Design a protein around this nucleic acid. Structure first.
Ligand code: PAR
Ligand code: PAR
Ligand code: K
Ligand code: K
Ligand code: K
Ligand code: K
Ligand code: K
Ligand code: MG
Ligand code: MG
Ligand code: MG
Ligand code: MG
Ligand code: MG
Ligand code: MG
Ligand code: MG
Ligand code: MG
Ligand code: MG
Ligand code: MG
Ligand code: MG
Ligand code: MG
Ligand code: MG
Ligand code: MG
Ligand code: MG
Ligand code: MG
Ligand code: MG
Ligand code: MG
Ligand code: MG
Ligand code: MG
Ligand code: MG
Ligand code: MG
Ligand code: MG
Ligand code: MG
Ligand code: MG
Ligand code: MG
Ligand code: MG
Ligand code: MG
Ligand code: MG
Ligand code: MG
Ligand code: MG
Ligand code: MG
Ligand code: MG
Ligand code: MG
Ligand code: MG
Ligand code: MG
Ligand code: MG
Ligand code: MG
Ligand code: MG
Ligand code: MG
Ligand code: MG
Ligand code: MG
Ligand code: MG
Ligand code: MG
Ligand code: MG
Ligand code: MG
Ligand code: MG
Ligand code: MG
Ligand code: MG
Ligand code: MG
Ligand code: MG
Lengths: 155, 73, 117
RNA sequence: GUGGGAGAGGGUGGUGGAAUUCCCGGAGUAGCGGUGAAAUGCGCAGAUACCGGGAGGAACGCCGAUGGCGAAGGCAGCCACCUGGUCCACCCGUGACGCUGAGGCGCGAAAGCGUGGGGAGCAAACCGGAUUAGAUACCCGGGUAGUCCACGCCCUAAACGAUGCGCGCUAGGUCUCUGGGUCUCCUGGGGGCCGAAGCUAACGCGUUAAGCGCGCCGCCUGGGGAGUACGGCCGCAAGGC
């Protein structure tokens, strides 16, 4: 996007909870344009959230999302002939995209046998502050602020 | 552009060649010890030329300083 | 163990490093810090963050002497000058004055080739 | 001639403050320095930063400028003495005493040479550290000559307005420096910009001529060979003409 600002797409509401965040997660689950497979996965996982946790699966979902969102990240920059790891803030939408993407990328690294189980277990784990996703956020916020010396290269 | 004030019109009758008159030459030095330019002093070529030498004359005597420290920065 | 409680905080900034020297009112130093006192080794010492850490470590060293009020004196143009200022400005120490005493000659010596023209 | 003006014009003596370095004392601790990043280097025999004292060499911040002075080179803290050039008013005096100028003579940035001093900072050479494919460099740490002083040499330059000197004639507008005056303005000297006529191959110049004229000097005659060779004069030599 060199000319315009590249406005964002508005997503259709969740067909079950009526929440755009849910539908965004389904789309990050989707693979080869299989919408039904991604939503089947996700909902079969919402049933796994219950009878393990007595809470509404929506709460666990958005809570884990909140625990994965990073506040800082490190972006490179070409300066003085070398390249520097420069921290700066994470725009809100980017915290969204990175938290959701990380959630999926973590769930598919898990050892559970079928998908929705991995998704449920990662959603729960990240909701209570553990699991591979939150380790991604902690690794990134470790990267940033470890380079605090370059905080003036913000741009 | 020094639209705050000019030092000459901030002053009445005075002798440019008085090296010993401090409480007026004081008015021509900056917050540091430096000699103000014609932007601030509002002097003319000849006037600033002579006032310069009488200020230097005063500096040797220990009446005006050569340099000062900057406050509040 | 002097119990000074009031003194002068010198700041020596340069494009290579920033170094803080904290003194009694007469000017004799009590403690000090810099970019190298903290773990910074290479060019990082000339950082405004390195300066911030140096001034904070200086202020914390001086708290152990129970110092409260300081007068700050900056010398040298260089990164981290104003950041060391702002580090001390709320470091716990009260800054009573800031003064820029950067030494300038009256055309005294010939600079290096690096600084000529 | 008289009476006033302006100026880093020159020489000599004296002298003031800032900074660097070094030495001394005090306080204080693990580094400082430096770079694109580094390293060499410096620091536990206590450095860097910080206060007090002291020594010495060099250079004069602001003022300061599109400013001034000078024939050119060039000239900048301040005080005094010696000394050059110039400008204005007054119409006083001399009565064409003028202009230019081969040769001559004097001057002549830097670098360089001799003797003797001095030597803080900077720094050819050189010694290291880096970089690079190499790096006899650019960058970093050191450092000798030198840079400074007296005296004597050398005599070159993008020594430049790349524009010899003098005098007369040819629209103006504007900025500035320094005089004079009936001080809105008039008038003289100097420094800038734009432009009449005009000139120029063009660029541009244009009352500060590169315009229109006169006087005298210096100089050019296609590029390389070559500022070389030879001769001569000069020089301690480098080398110059
Ligand atoms: N020349 C040194 C300087 O003289 C300045 O003052 C100088 C000028 O202001 C002053 O001008 C004088 C004066 O009598 C009047 N205005 C006219 C007179 N023709 C000038 O004298 C002039 O001509 C004579 C030879 O005839 C020269 O010796 C002298 O140097 C020159 N100034 O003469 C002084 C000496 O030249 C300042 N004192 C200072 O800048 C510095 O010391
Ligand atoms: N000293 C003032 C000036 O000295 C000039 O020459 C003087 C100086 O060049 C020379 O050296 C002097 C001397 O006191 C002694 N040998 C050492 C002293 N440090 C020097 O004095 C000067 O030296 C330089 C300039 O050379 C200046 O930068 C510095 O301020 C001053 N210390 O001594 C000369 C006098 O004896 C001229 N006479 C003239 O410009 C003026 O009077
Ligand atoms: K040394
Ligand atoms: K100079
Ligand atoms: K000029
Ligand atoms: K007048
Ligand atoms: K032109
Ligand atoms: Mg991952
Ligand atoms: Mg450094
Ligand atoms: Mg003079
Ligand atoms: Mg000592
Ligand atoms: Mg060692
Ligand atoms: Mg020991
Ligand atoms: Mg040793
Ligand atoms: Mg030192
Ligand atoms: Mg001292
Ligand atoms: Mg010595
Ligand atoms: Mg200037
Ligand atoms: Mg002239
Ligand atoms: Mg001239
Ligand atoms: Mg010149
Ligand atoms: Mg007559
Ligand atoms: Mg007659
Ligand atoms: Mg002649
Ligand atoms: Mg001749
Ligand atoms: Mg010469
Ligand atoms: Mg010389
Ligand atoms: Mg010599
Ligand atoms: Mg010698
Ligand atoms: Mg010697
Ligand atoms: Mg020596
Ligand atoms: Mg050196
Ligand atoms: Mg060197
Ligand atoms: Mg080498
Ligand atoms: Mg190469
Ligand atoms: Mg020798
Ligand atoms: Mg010249
Ligand atoms: Mg020129
Ligand atoms: Mg001209
Ligand atoms: Mg000229
Ligand atoms: Mg001419
Ligand atoms: Mg000529
Ligand atoms: Mg003549
Ligand atoms: Mg004129
Ligand atoms: Mg001129
Ligand atoms: Mg023109
Ligand atoms: Mg025409
Ligand atoms: Mg034209
Ligand atoms: Mg003419
Ligand atoms: Mg010839
Ligand atoms: Mg010729
Ligand atoms: Mg031929
Ligand atoms: Mg030739
Ligand atoms: Mg030759
Ligand atoms: Mg011969
Ligand atoms: Mg001979
Ligand atoms: Mg040779
Ligand atoms: Mg020969």
């Amino acid at each position: 996007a060199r000319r315009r600002r590249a406005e964002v797409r508005q997503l259709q509401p969740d067909l079950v909870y009526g929440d755009v965040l849910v539908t965004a997660f389904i789309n990050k689950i989707m693979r080869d344009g299989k919408k039904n497979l991604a939503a089947r996965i996700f909902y079969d996982a919402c049933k796994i959230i219950q009878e393990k946790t007595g809470q509404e699966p929506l709460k666990v979902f958005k809570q884990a999302v909140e625990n994965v969102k990073p506040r800082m990240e490190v972006r490179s920059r070409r300066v003085g002939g070398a390249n520097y790891q420069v921290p700066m803030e994470v725009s809100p939408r980017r915290q969204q995209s990175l938290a959701l993407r990380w959630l999926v990328q973590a769930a598919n690294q898990r050892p559970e046998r079928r998908a929705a189980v991995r998704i449920a277990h990662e959603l729960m784990d990240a909701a209570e502050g553990k699991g591979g996703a939150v380790k991604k956020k902690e690794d990134v916020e470790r990267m940033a602020e470890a380079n605090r010396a370059y905080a003036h290269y913000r741009w | 552009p020094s639209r705050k004030a000019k030092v000459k019109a901030t002053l009445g009758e005075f002798d440019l060649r008085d090296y010993r008159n401090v409480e007026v030459l004081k008015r021509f030095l900056s917050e540091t010890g430096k000699i103000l330019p014609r932007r601030r002093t509002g002097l003319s070529a000849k006037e600033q030329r002579i006032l310069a030498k009488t200020i230097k004359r005063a500096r040797i005597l220990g009446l005006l300083p050569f340099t000062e420290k900057l406050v509040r920065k | 163990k002097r119990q000074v409680a009031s003194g002068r905080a010198y700041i020596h900034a340069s494009y290579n490093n920033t170094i803080v020297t904290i003194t009694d009112p007469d000017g004799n130093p009590i403690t000090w810090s810099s970019g190298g006192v903290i773990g910074y080794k290479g060019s990082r010492k000339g950082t405004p963050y390195a300066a911030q850490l140096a001034a904070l470590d200086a202020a914390k060293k001086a708290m152990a002497y129970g110092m409260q009020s300081v007068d700050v004196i900056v010398r040298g143009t260089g990164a981290g000058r104003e950041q060391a200022i702002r580090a001390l400005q709320a470091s716990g120490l009260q800054v009573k004055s800031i003064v820029d005493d950067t030494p300038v000659p009256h055309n005294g010596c010939r600079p290096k080739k690096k600084f000529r023209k």
